[PDB]
Amino acid sequence: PKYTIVDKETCIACGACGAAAPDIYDYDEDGIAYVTLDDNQGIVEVPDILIDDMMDAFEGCPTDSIKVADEPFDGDPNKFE
Ligand code: SF4
Numbered sequence: 001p002k003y004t005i006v007d008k009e010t011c012i013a014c015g016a017c018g019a020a021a022p023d024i025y026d027y028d029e030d031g032i033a034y035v036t037l038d039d040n041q042g043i044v045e046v047p048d049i050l051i052d053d054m055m056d057a058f059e060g061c062p063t064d065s066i067k068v069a070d071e072p073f074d075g076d077p078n079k080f081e
Helices: 018-021 050-058
Strands: 004-005 026-027 033-035 064-068
Touching: 004 050, 018 026, 018 050, 050 064
Parallel strands: none
Antiparallel strands: 004 033, 004 064, 026 033
């Protein structure tokens, strides 16, 4: 499986990820991205049909703020660092 999460501490509010993967990422009132699948907790497996969009958003993010992993993040975007 795949899980994804935004590191809100590094996001620069550029609007690219919601364009790449609108069913996965949206934004708070200040434009900081978050994963809508699971309220940015990194615990809901990304649907198979959405993985390619997820990878577009992940690869495109200018500040490497989107994380992807094969195990849940359990709330911590920096778990695998
Ligand atoms: S693409 Fe990256 S920097 Fe831009 S809004 Fe999404 S998470 Fe933030």
